[PDB]
Amino acid sequence: DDPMIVAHRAGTRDFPENTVLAITNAVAAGVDGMWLTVQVSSDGVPVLYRPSDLATLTDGAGPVNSKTVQQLQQLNAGWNFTTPGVEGHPYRQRATPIPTLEQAIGATPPDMTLFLDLQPLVSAVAQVLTRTGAAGRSIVYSTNADITAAASRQEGLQVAESRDVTRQRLFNMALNHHCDPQPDPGKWAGFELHRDVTVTEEFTLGSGISAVNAELWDEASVDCFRSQSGMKVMGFAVKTVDDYRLAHKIGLDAVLVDSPLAAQQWRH
Amino acid sequence: DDPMIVAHRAGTRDFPENTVLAITNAVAAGVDGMWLTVQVSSDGVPVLYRPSDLATLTDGAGPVNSKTVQQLQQLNAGWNFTTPGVEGHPYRQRATPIPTLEQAIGATPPDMTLFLDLQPLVSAVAQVLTRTGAAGRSIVYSTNADITAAASRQEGLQVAESRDVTRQRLFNMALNHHCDPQPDPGKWAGFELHRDVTVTEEFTLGSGISAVNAELWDEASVDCFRSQSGMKVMGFAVKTVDDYRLAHKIGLDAVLVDSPLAAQQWRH
Ligand SMILES: [Ca+2]
Ligand SMILES: [Ca+2]
Incomplete structure (x- = not known):
């Protein structure tokens, strides 16, 4: 079958990332999962925002936790969005x-699976997921092992494998052909199809x-992750049709795409 | 055919490394190449010695270039040699x-190929190789790209590929399956069969x-180095019969062994 199409930051290429406009359009484009970046306001409300500073994508400045949710919801997160070839910033107006x-x-x-890329953020997110009943369809992700571990201490949260463990298993497979450490049953894991690294001796x-x-995902490494384990694997930074063809051939469960609209063309 | 058996430091497990006693015994054990570690005396004579300080293997102390050749040749480089299971230091007497x-x-x-693991050392070595006529059967090696480059500026010296380039090609093959950079025609290259590294993202x-x-040497990476290039490849740190079997199966030109006596058993 086909890998799940997961909208990266709700589809950052097509519409302002991490906005309801982008989410709604991504659903309409047929995606199978929604990847959202989560931070917390000064008054403890989780909001969607990826950069470390509000100036990167909004008309405000400062860290997310320097503002209340009421202040954050007044900021225009389309302030700096551009459409290629087109001049100007169409969402400033x-x-x-x-x-x-x-x-x-x-x-x-x-039905839609949410991938939430992330104290007090972890507790605040757990509380929203509990009260909304969305914990059963949400997967908490982080590049940071300390965030993964904190998420796993919250009752009811589904948590992706830590990036440290996923990376170790992928590099062991690539460099010495051992499936070590053993798979972690039932967990999601993800990694870029192409990743710049440095190797030191x-x-x-x-x-x-x-x-x-x-390039760490191949038939052998997918089988290492998934065989008799129930693990699910996602390819990050899937951009080209060649990336999609690789993911499809090796059986990745999901691909993380910046353009749900472009990804539609991969399924017909 | 069989990989060349190359005595590492003249066969460090069997007899005191980098001594004439070890060299003579390694020849008698049937080795096909001789790997020797070279430093230079204060008065410009290349000598065989691997550690940075004379105290590691001799009854003297200090760097090699802190002593004249006459002083160095009075030191006993068997001072700390031990035979396993046997007590004492049999070469102190x-x-x-x-x-x-x-x-x-x-x-x-x-007929024997010498691998010499290395200003003024490079010039001093070049002068010995020129005057003895051994330049045609000697290959200069270093882990240090600056030493490789200096050796290549000496007329008549045969120089192994720099470790930086060999390592880059091996890791490109292992991690992205590209034979990049291209082979360097006619050159020797070497690397351990197993190597601890760190990977950073x-x-x-x-x-x-x-x-x-x-574990960077396999059929694919050997073919990348050798196909249509005339490159020759050596496996470093070949210790077990399993190491030898791997090197033989993939067609390494040479294996670097601490025990020529043990390696004899691999050929009958
Ligand atoms: Ca679903
Ligand atoms: Ca020869």
């Missing part, structure tokens, strides 16, 4: 505000370093 | 002195690190 996580959940249909005095682009 | 590179060359037969804030053991 048609604002797409920062939404709460709760609003985002409500803008998705009951140590000598008596000094070291040697190589910059290398790693 | 039967000294194996530090030899000059020139003496080492003379202790090897005219960078995030917006912070990084992720994995410690991984890399």
Whole structure:
């Protein structure tokens, strides 16, 4: 079958990322999952926002937790969005505000899996997921092992495998062909199809370093993750039709795409 | 056919490394190549010695270039050699002195390839190789790209591919299946069959690190190095019969062994 199409930041190429406008359009484009970046307001309300500073995508400035939710929802998260070839910022005159996580959940249909890329953020997210009943369709992700571990201490939260463990297993497979550590049953794991890394070896005095682009998902590594484990695997940064063809051939459960509209063409 | 058996430091497990006694015994054990570690005396004579300080293997102390060749040749390079299971230091009473590179060359037969693991060292080595006529059967190696480049500026010296380039090609093959950079025609290259490395990826804030053991020589990477290039490839740190079987199966040109006596058993 086909990999799930997951809208990265609700489809950052097509519409202002992490907005309800983008979420609604991504659903309409037929995506199978919704990947959203979550931060918390100064008054403890999870909101959707990816950058470390509000100036990157809005008309405000400062960290998300420097503002109340009422202040954040007045900011236009389409402030800097551009459409290629087209000049100007089309959403400066048609604002797409920062939404709460709760609003985002409500803008998705009951079947749709949410991937939430993330103290007190973890507790605040757990409370929203509990009260809305969306914990059963939401997967908490982080690149940071401390966030993964904190999420796993919250009752009822489904948590992706930590990136440290996923990366270790992928590099063991690529470099020594061992499926180590063992799969973690039932968990989601994800990684880029192409990833710049540095490899370092140590000598008596000094070291040697190589910059290398790693392509870690292949039939063997997918089988290592998934065989007899129930693990599900997602390819990150799936951009080209060639990326999609690779993911399809090797049987990735999901692909993370910036353009749900472009991805529609991969299914007909 | 069989990989060449190359005595690492003249066969460090069997007899005091980098001594004429070890070289002579390694020849008698049927090795096909001789790997020797070269440093230079304060008065410009290349000698065989691997550690940074004389205290590691001799009854003297200090760097090699802190002593004249006359002083170095009085030191017993068997001072700390031990035979497993056997107690004591059997060469404290039967000294194996530090030899000059020139003496080492003379202790090897005219057919034997020398791998010399290395200002003014490079010039001093070039001068010995020129005057003895051994440049045609000697390959200069270093882990350090600056030493490789200096050796390549000396007329008549045969120089192994730099470790930086060999490592880059091996990791490109292992991680993305590209034979990049292209082979360097006619050159020797070498690398361990198993190598501890660290892999680092960078995030917006912070990084992720994995410690991984890399097994970089396989049929595909050997073919990348050797096909239509005339490159010759050596496996370093070949210790077990399983290591030998791998090297043989994939067609490595040579294996670097600490025990020529043990390696004899791999050929009958
Ligand atoms: Ca679903
Ligand atoms: Ca020869």
